[PDB]
């Protein structure tokens, strides 16, 4: 313009092992109806910015007289 140790590496890997073995409940992906509000607000604001930019993108017509 915090490097991780191999011990906690193996601990996290084994945590993913047991969490994949015991149950992969795919129903847990559903948001709790509050973070989804924030996610939708962020996405719609990004869409509003992009669409207001890309609403209007031979020369174009001018409001001026010739």
């Amino acid at each position: 313009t915090l490097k991780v140790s191999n011990q906690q590496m193996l601990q996290q890997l084994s945590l993913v092992m047991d969490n994949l073995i015991n149950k992969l409940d795919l129903n847990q992906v559903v948001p709790n109806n509050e973070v989804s509000n924030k996610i939708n607000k962020r996405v719609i604001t990004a869409i509003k910015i992009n669409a207001k930019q890309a609403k209007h993108n031979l020369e174009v017509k001018s409001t001026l007289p010739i």
Partner: protein, 51 residues
């Protein structure tokens, strides 16, 4: 493939413009026409049509 005898190895001064975003049409500096988008020149701040 160029020849070994060619010794015209020169640095080329050039700029990388930023894609300007504007909903209002503005006059381009290359064709003098109203253009929505463009690229503002990194050296002299004159917008261009294409790259």
């Amino acid at each position: 493939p160029v020849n070994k005898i060619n010794k015209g190895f020169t640095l080329v001064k050039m700029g990388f413009p930023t894609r300007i975003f504007e909903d209002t049409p503005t006059f381009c500096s290359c064709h003098s026409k109203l253009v929505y988008g463009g690229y503002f020149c990194p050296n002299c701040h004159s917008k261009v049509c294409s790259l």
